[PDB]
Amino acid sequence: SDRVSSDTAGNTATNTQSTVGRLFGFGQRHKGKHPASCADTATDKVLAAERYYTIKLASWTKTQESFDHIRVPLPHALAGENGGVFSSTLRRHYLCKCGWRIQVQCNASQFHAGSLLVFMAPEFDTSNHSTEVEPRADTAFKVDANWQKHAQILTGHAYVNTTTKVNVPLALNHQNFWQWTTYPHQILNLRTNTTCDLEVPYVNVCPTSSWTQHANWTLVIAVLTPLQYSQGSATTIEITASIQPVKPVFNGLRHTVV
Amino acid sequence: GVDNAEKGKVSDDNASTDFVAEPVKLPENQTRVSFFYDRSTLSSVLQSTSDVSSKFTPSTAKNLQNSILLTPLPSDIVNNSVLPEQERWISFASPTTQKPPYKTKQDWNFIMFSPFTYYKCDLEVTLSKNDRETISSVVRYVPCGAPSDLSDQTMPQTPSLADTRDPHMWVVGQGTTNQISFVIPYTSPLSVLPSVWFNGFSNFDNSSRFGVAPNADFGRLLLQGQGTFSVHYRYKKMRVFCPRPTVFIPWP
Amino acid sequence: GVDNAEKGKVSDDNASTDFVAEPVKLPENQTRVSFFYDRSTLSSVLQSTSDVSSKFTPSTAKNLQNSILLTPLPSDIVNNSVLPEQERWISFASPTTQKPPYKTKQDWNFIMFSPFTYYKCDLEVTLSKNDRETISSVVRYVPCGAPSDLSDQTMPQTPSLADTRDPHMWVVGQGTTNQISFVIPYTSPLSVLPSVWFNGFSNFDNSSRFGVAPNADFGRLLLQGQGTFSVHYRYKKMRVFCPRPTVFIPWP
Amino acid sequence: SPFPVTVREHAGTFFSTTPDTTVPVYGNTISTPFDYMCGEFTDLLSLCKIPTFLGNLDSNKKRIPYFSATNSTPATPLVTYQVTLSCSCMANSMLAAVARNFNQYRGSLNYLFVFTGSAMTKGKFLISYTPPGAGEPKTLDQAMQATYAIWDLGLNSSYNFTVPFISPTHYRQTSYNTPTITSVDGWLTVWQLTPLTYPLGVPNDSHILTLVSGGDDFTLRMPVTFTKYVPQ
Amino acid sequence: SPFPVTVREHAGTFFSTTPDTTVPVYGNTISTPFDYMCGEFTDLLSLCKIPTFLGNLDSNKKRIPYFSATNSTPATPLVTYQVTLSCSCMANSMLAAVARNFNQYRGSLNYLFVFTGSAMTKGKFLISYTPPGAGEPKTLDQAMQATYAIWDLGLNSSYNFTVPFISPTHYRQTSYNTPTITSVDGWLTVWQLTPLTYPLGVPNDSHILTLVSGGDDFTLRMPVTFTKYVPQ
């Protein structure tokens, strides 16, 4: 009952009956102040853009191992048509600045076992690691379609051919997942909770973002404990997410992209 | 006692929570970020075979250039760039041994321990000659993203590097102690610098090397005069943001 | 908004004049004339093959004299003058290459960027030996327009340049650091110096070289002792008057 | 008049850690404003206190962030961690990563266990911390003889266990060549007190996540560089 | 008694930018009076704010301080300037000449257009500033989608257009090797909204002078030397 929580955002509302609270990364919220690096008065407080956008993320099966994960580049994950007015406004602006409030959903039963780590990370590598090809605009910022394995990111992944890889011991896109818990996060333990609630402020190398070139935040869902269940229990276990851009700011109005 | 890690945060306990014990804390402040990074660590090496009174021309010799990019992150000549640029990975200098030295320049202590996503600081640089032969050298410091000006001498027998208003240093003689040190302010147009990765491109057609931020450095150092010089960085008034994972270490 | 450039002056606007925007200014004072010019820039080079204890005699060797005229503007031996004089133009040292070095001495940074017609300042001079052989040199500073006194030694085995009450410097030994620096006050009889052109003659029969002002310099430096020495100028308490065009730059 | 000076015997020495500054060559420069920033932290200790994962061994000798328990009570501990910020099991935790850059530590250590089995699974564990001097505890009888807490599964999923700082010295070394009484401090072992118990239709193996971090009164001191290695 | 000193490791170094003075060898000298002087200025920014000419290309690829317009409305911009103090079109303006000696800039840019056609000539231009991210505007429809002002000819001859400072960073680079998001900031394009219109006996081509300068809140910082070149 203290675990029943409702959250309104524009014309949308998330509801959960097993919340463990909302974690505020860095104990900060994006307040929506205009970037001091822009002279033009920003476009803001667009109610049609300050809502939750819900999307399906993945299917969790018994084959996923600890640290296999799924990445959701932001704001790009919502820069497509399904991003509604946030997207259509974003595409027509040079710069955007915002925070994120997110809830990832995933229910099992009292007879299933397993757990996920739900976290937000700034400057978290979202490029593909199954190839030695340089990441490009249309491949670097895409939501993972398949679970990513973990071994090849511990020391990073150089965009060089397999034989050169031998003489490259470390790449700057390395991610020591044993410490992924140092990022603002929550754990989705099947026996405890079917939802995780996070919120992070705006962080970047600069006042506002030229988003077309940079996915500054990444929502990541990684399994910590493999999914387990006995013969007879529901086999389809899926993961979903409600993503809300917090008080976004737009500057530099222009014609649309693509 | 019991708790719930799914909250994303659990209490920091001491022995008194579950047992008959007392807190045992003693004051200590050597863990402060400012204090920790406020010390000099080897971060680069430079080599020149040109005299002081000559035209500076970019060169490489066994993985050592006569100029460096001021950044704790790995840097090196990238895809035949004229001057070194920030790298995205480290490589062994040797094509066979699979053991260091690396061909890339960096502050190993920073790369191996930078549990933050962004940092801000001033940079204290120390340049030291590797042998005892009397030093005779000229160094030019170029602010972050400023013109390198790799031009000809405008006057005969003068060090082209000194032909600038950019901050430069000239040390020579029997009375000197073969080193140079100075501190430069943060000069990047970025508010804070990415300490490990930059999840994006640096130009508008997204054709740059993904992973490297635009102008994420403290400028460059160009050198002329004979010798091999080691470089140290010391991070003044250091400030870090957003905790993140450290480099992984092989399991014992 | 609309305006009329024919007035000879139009307003300095910010984004708020025509659009829904705010001023975005941040304090900054590195553009002050005093601060900008208050740094050392290479401005000359000197060479001598005579020992300290000998009679100073004007010489030239591959475009380098053993004395200089203290002025940021180009200077060189003009029409076989005994000592260098202010030039009215810059020439390549080489008769073929059509590339620098130039045979003329000047502060390239000043020539390339002097958006004013007149200037006033004190001069901080730095003289550095181009190699590490122990220095043994004597320099004589002669105020603007004062007698050069290129006389014989009055006593055997003494540096003739030191045989004066004019300010002079003597550096020698294993404990020195092969350089000299000092600051001299503005000494020209002119109230302010012309920074680029002087539209007139310097004597009464108008026979001098049109374009060069009379006594428009900070004096001269004569040197004896072995070696090649580079010179730097630093403009103290710099003051400039009457804005004017900068040197043209070829279209990209 | 000029001041007489006595040039000390260390003239020209470059001290990497002198507490003094050097010559500014580009002063009066504004550091690009960053007042909009968030997430700043000023003490590395903050990191040490964030619980991160311990690496437990798989049945195939692969490293995993948890251990297994089932419907039985082994006569031996399910896991054993030697209390040393040098322990290989915590080699990749933020606590160890930070400690590798300091010479000594003092204070509490927090070992966090998160039960990930089904909601229908019950059971009790006995988490014990045995100070040194008489060797590692060989039986439950011995393990209970030292500092311990009984962890009962239920509504709350995790147990925050504290290894009290019990030491002959005020500070302890974070690493060592050979174990000494100032660098190795005993063992943390978790035993199965009662078997994990459950109904039909529930997988026999339950996974318990294991994490470590410094406690409330934990501190580190003396900035140093750890033994270098080649990443791989 | 003599004072003990620790000679630092940089003994004898000549720092071209040390904020300190050196030894005066001809002091107590009066600087020739100049109190009668006029025209003194103390800030180089003053220069940056004086509008000077942009170099536009001739039909013969010769540089001229203006562009042409006539009785028609092209589907493409009459002129296009990339906002960079590095733009070749403004290479010889005082603004660029000064900026070449500084590392970064911030603030407004003023693009001044002066109509030089006859008094009987009328017309309207649409001056647009397009921030980057989606490339250069290809049509009037796109150019109007960004910051713009409509300039109507008449009694007043010129139009003072401001390129607002819109940037992800507080400061931007004045030059670059390859364009980056911190050194290139979009485009200023001027379009013909309505055709230049006029009576008989009036030349078909009107010339519009083009100038640039820093705006009210424009600043530069970090004194540097630009890439040297051989005058010609």
Binding site: - | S34, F36, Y186 | - | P19, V23, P24, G27, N28, P33 | -
Partner: peptide, 24 residues
């Protein structure tokens, strides 16, 4: 951290350190 000299810095604070400024 790591400055422990009791006499004040010889170079003024504006010059010894970059100047921190808030844009708001």
């Amino acid at each position: 951290g790591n400055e422990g000299v009791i006499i004040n810095n010889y170079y003024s604070n504006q010059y010894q350190n970059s100047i921190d400024l808030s844009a708001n």
